[PDB]
Amino acid sequence: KIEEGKLVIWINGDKGYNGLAEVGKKFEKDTGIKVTVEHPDKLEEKFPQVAATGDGPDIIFWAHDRFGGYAQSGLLAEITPDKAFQDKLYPFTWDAVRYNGKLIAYPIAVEALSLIYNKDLLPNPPKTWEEIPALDKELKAKGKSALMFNLQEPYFTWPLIAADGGYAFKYENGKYDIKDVGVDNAGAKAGLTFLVDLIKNKHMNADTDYSIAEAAFNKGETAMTINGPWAWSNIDTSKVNYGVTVLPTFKGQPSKPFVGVLSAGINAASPNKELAKEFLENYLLTDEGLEAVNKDKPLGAVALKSYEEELVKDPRIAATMENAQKGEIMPNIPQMSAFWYAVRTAVINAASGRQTVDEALKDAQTNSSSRRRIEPWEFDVFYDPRELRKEACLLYEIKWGASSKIWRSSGKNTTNHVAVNFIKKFTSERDFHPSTSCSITWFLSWSPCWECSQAIREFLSRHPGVTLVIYVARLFAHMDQQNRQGLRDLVNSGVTIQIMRDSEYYHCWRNFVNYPPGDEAHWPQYPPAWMMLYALELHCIILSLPPCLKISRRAQNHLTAFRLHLQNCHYQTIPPHILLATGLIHPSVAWR
Amino acid sequence: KIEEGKLVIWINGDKGYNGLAEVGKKFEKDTGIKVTVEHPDKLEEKFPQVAATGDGPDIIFWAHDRFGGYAQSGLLAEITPDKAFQDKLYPFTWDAVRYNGKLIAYPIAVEALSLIYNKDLLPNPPKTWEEIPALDKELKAKGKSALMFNLQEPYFTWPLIAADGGYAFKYENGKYDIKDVGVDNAGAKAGLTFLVDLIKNKHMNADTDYSIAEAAFNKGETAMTINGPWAWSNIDTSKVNYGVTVLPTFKGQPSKPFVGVLSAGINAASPNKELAKEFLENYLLTDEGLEAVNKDKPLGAVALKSYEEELVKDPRIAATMENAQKGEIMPNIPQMSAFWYAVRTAVINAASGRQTVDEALKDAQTNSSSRRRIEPWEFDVFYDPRELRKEACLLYEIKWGASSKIWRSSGKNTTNHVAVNFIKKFTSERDFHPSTSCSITWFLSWSPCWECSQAIREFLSRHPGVTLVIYVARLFAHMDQQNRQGLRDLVNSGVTIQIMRDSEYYHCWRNFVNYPPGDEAHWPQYPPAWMMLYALELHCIILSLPPCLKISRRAQNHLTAFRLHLQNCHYQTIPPHILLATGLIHPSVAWR
Ligand SMILES: OC[C@H]1O[C@H](O[C@H]2[C@H](O)[C@@H](O)[C@@H](O)O[C@@H]2CO)[C@H](O)[C@@H](O)[C@@H]1O
Ligand SMILES: OC[C@H]1O[C@H](O[C@H]2[C@H](O)[C@@H](O)[C@@H](O)O[C@@H]2CO)[C@H](O)[C@@H](O)[C@@H]1O
Ligand SMILES: OC[C@H]1O[C@H](O[C@H]2[C@H](O)[C@@H](O)[C@@H](O)O[C@@H]2CO)[C@H](O)[C@@H](O)[C@@H]1O
Ligand SMILES: C[As](C)(=O)[O-]
Ligand SMILES: C[As](C)(=O)[O-]
Ligand SMILES: [Zn+2]
Ligand SMILES: [Zn+2]
């Protein structure tokens, strides 16, 4: 767990955890800090749950796709690599680890799927997918199956989908569109139908996973497979004459597999961020340590120019990099998460006889762009009476008096305050519903800033028929004259502002959180201390009164000082029920 | 709540409420302030219940015995009469209305019980109690009663108890001893035994109350009665030729009834202190006002020298004054309440035969200095939001392992920290209770101070076999090196100290508080903020840590400043469950 003077690292079990542990033991021999490497099941999903509470790993190794979402939730800490060390790595890798113009993780290596074929059972690999069935038949009469790969994860099935036009959040103008998804394109459907046909035609088993595929190829039972560099080690120990080459073409077009950038991020809650930076910049990302890691399980094209200079000489590395070039780099935006959850489901339903290709891809098309859901860990990270610097919070519920139906969704911090983002979405999409007489209800943790107050006021004056109500859980810089006037302005302009309470939190839990089936309505009872304190301060703001409480923090959640100063002014003008509700003052005497 | 610009007065229905109302009407005609007089049932007990909430009357008329307790609860306000006016009343009256060197009420008049006899049915009243049965027999042959008086209230039966040495509290120069009680004295036993004999011997009925007694005397059914001046009016309208004289002598000794000083106290919460002072000093305590009150229901000898000087000429007033002289001044200490509540029961149990005279007097003797059933209003005056320095909970429950019986009761401040009071009481009564095993459980308000800690440790060392557990609700001067080291000292000496929580308060409510009959097991749900805060500070104390929170008060319960300073030391050593329970910090920091 995150201990002082200790490093806890999490890396996928398929990679070189022992090699990384050896590098860590060298770090321990030099500085005296135990480096413990762990590989839990589906760490990409366990990491936020434990990092939010605080008991997690000091460093996390994984692709760059989920690092975006992590940094969005404020789980990763910014890395400061001087220009000398920054110039040591290729610019593509750094561009892959940059979120909102800020570096969030150290690039370790590049990984792309490649076609590994048994040179003994097949001297010349096939150049196209259409000839795979015939080949399979010819080898089935001999007692062996060909081209067996993991069908459980969409990362392996995506090359066929993208071969003829599979766009995942089309990119243009330097920005990735979330609404425009391509998993339902003609080419995507064609590729998935071909794979489903390969399964139906008895050429491939839908139950095949990474373990079964790798074991069958290592035992000479299969002539081909699709995998990255990590498998090369076990394949070498299998003494099977194999060859790594490019992936076959689908309908005369090159298969486009996503390019993953294995990177290491530093936990924002770990107090050993200095030790983490030292370990990753001085011992891991060097020819010595990176070579030791590569020794256990190969990691493909590395990010270090010093090592890559003589590592690209391996034809296997060259084939993987060629496949990556033919492919496209994986985006690191947060929505990617949902994207995969959708494709992974579609692929499964396409492998089984539950849904057709069109049905699965259409459901994935409509679910890849989802913002109607929110996880419980991130709910505790944003909607909580306790402070977290990364505001990034908005639960909006729009109701139209005409149809009397609630349309709910969320919003996060995208290089701009969420208020400005919702305003832009409302102004851009004119087809709301009848487009008039709408009641908007916001559930955000931090109070709108002065600039956001002016923007929301201009937006509300722009559209007359908008009944807007705001529920805030925390107060952003409640001791800034401008923020004060902004909140008073919003209230005076017809915007109700109230501090979230038990009712509001439970309502948000039921309507927005992706709570598990069993724990239905089991919302996390938050302490009323800060709820009542922020309510008292907010009422002092509305009454143009001086600040009563003063907070003094120093880190993401470190509270050093807290003071409550109630002047004669407060006792004389602030209503008594609020003071009595905070529980810190006496009732009968507050009234006298 | 208490109204502005209005005077509300509460006086017992047996006094001249109409006369007081007319004086208030004159005050209204002169200053334009409606003075409304009310007479609620059992106001001596209703007044504190409403005064704790703050609502109630502006002025209260009653004996000074209950004013001491009222003042200790912070319910009465200090009066500031000038010397010119103070010299208008008798000095000993002010002495009776003085509590802790401060005048808490305006003395109105003095009242003492007198023997009222029907001059037609009895020409010569009896001079001794021993001849009362004889007289009775004669009148029984006539179809009349000899002596019928209210025996439900101990105020009427006390003269016989004190006739041969019955004292409520011990009398010393400036020192009124609470522990030394004389309700178990030989003379007290003899007096109550004579009363019980009068009841058992068919000379008096044990169910006789004030109503039946007064009505029977006014209807010529009985030849004698015992009453004060207030009954004189109704007796005058009864057309019965009566006479007021001194009380008979028991065993050749004069009957000693407590003398009540009817006084008017000003509610400490009422915002009309000035109006109350004016009404009491300029219109009520004058010859005109006192005469207008005397016309309705006589008040006996008033405290005003101008009126009393020419009022003593009435033989009835002279007889009342003689009974008062031969009697004794009623103490105004708070414990008086319990005292009476004790005697009241004893007497009843002796009249109904449910308990013998010795049993009733012994129980009254043991429960006259304390009270085993605390009222809810005074229990509300004891809690953590109230910073009031005066009241000290001192709820103690002692079990004797030899019998597995629990002894429950309370105690108060009385010019000495409750610690030394309990030490002295236990050291004095050690011989009367069981032999060796003992486990004391304290539920007190303020954490023992430096001096109290040293006294407690020396008491615990003086008695080897004593297991003491302390549950405190607040922390007194938690920023004093001496108090700090004292608490640590008590802990190191084998004494457990913990901050009271919901469970402890519920236990105190169910076992010590006089729970309401209709509302059973409903303990007052109080906010936990200060409970958790004082708990965090207590842990900082025990762990020899620097002060964490700092309070800054300005009035009775006016909290002007409250600061929480959690240094790195605190975060590093304080247990995380306490910090997390306060609700002001994040679990991430607590976990680390
Ligand atoms: O949750 C499944 C996961 O699939 C992909 O993860 C890849 C990973 O990027 C590679 O480094 C390698 O380890 O194979 C994994 C599939 O087993 C996606 O990268 C990821 O977004 C997704 O969550
Ligand atoms: O959520 C992002 C987070 O970044 C920073 O968090 C780190 C930071 O690296 C440190 O300088 C220090 O301030 O606290 C954290 C690690 O101890 C910031 O705290 C803040 O911008 C933000 O919350
Ligand atoms: O403690 C019991 C109760 O007894 C006496 O009360 C008398 C009072 O003195 C009389 O003036 C009359 O008006 O009311 C009571 C008789 O029922 C004590 O004087 C009183 O203080 C005390 O509370
Ligand atoms: C989401 As904000 C920092 O504008 O309140
Ligand atoms: C601190 As104390 C008045 O209970 O001795
Ligand atoms: Zn903003
Ligand atoms: Zn003390």
Author numbering:
A (entry chain B), B (entry chain A): 2 to 371, 1015 to 1236
Source paper text:
APOBEC1 (APO1), a member of AID/APOBEC nucleic acid cytosine deaminase family, can edit apolipoprotein B mRNA to regulate cholesterol metabolism. This APO1 RNA editing activity requires a cellular cofactor to achieve tight regulation. Despite the diverse biological function of different APOBEC family members, they all share a highly conserved core deaminase domain (CDD) structure that is composed of a five-β-stranded (β1–β5) sheet adjoined by six helices (h1–h6), with a Zn atom coordinated at the active center. Full-length human APO1 contains 236 residues, with the N-terminal residues 15–187 being the CDD that bears high sequence homology to other APOBECs, and the C-terminal residues 188–236 after the CDD being unique to APO1.
